[PDB]
């Protein structure tokens, strides 16, 4: 139950290929033109 050997830099960088953050679901707000998250209330204006 211990690592029998090192994980080389190649293996490391390989495993984390799919480890990333997604760009937010952002759309432009119709009253102010600033971006907002879709289905959420704009925090700059306060609309829909």
């Amino acid at each position: 139950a211990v690592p029998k050997r090192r994980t080389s830099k190649t293996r490391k960088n390989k495993r984390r290929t799919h480890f990333k953050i997604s760009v937010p679901g952002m759309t432009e707000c119709p009253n102010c033109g600033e971006y907002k998250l879709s289905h959420r209330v704009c925090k700059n204006c306060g609309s829909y």
């Binding site: 990333k20 953050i21 760009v23 937010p24 952002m26 600033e34 971006y35 907002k36 998250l37």
Partner: protein, 112 residues
């Protein structure tokens, strides 16, 4: 041509800051700001401020207006780590490395 802005010894481990910077690489200034302000991560407020400084730097020092700016390249690299310990079981102590980050952002007009 190129505006610079750097934040040093920020108290966030570099693996964690780089996850957010892998999004604003090569995007426009407005879109970049909208990403940061809406991405719900810890490093995001501290980067939105390094970007802000660069852009201000651009306007106040080069007359580089912000409507045409793109994060030419933006990265983060290790900083002066702070070493601490956690009292674990059976008298043994394990280490905790509180890391830091040297955030850099450069925005360009794409021109010469």
């Amino acid at each position: 041509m190129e505006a610079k802005a750097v934040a040093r010894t920020i108290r966030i481990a570099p693996r964690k800051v780089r996850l957010v910077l892998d999004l604003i690489r090569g995007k426009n200034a407005a879109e970049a700001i909208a990403i940061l302000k809406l991405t719900n991560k810890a490093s995001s407020p501290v980067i939105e401020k390094v970007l802000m400084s660069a852009l201000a730097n651009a306007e106040h020092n080069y007359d580089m207006n912000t409507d045409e700016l793109v994060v030419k390249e933006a990265y983060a690299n290790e900083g002066p780590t702070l070493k601490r310990f956690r009292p674990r079981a059976q008298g043994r102590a394990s280490a905790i490395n509180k890391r830091t980050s040297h955030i850099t952002i450069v925005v360009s007009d794409g021109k010469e």
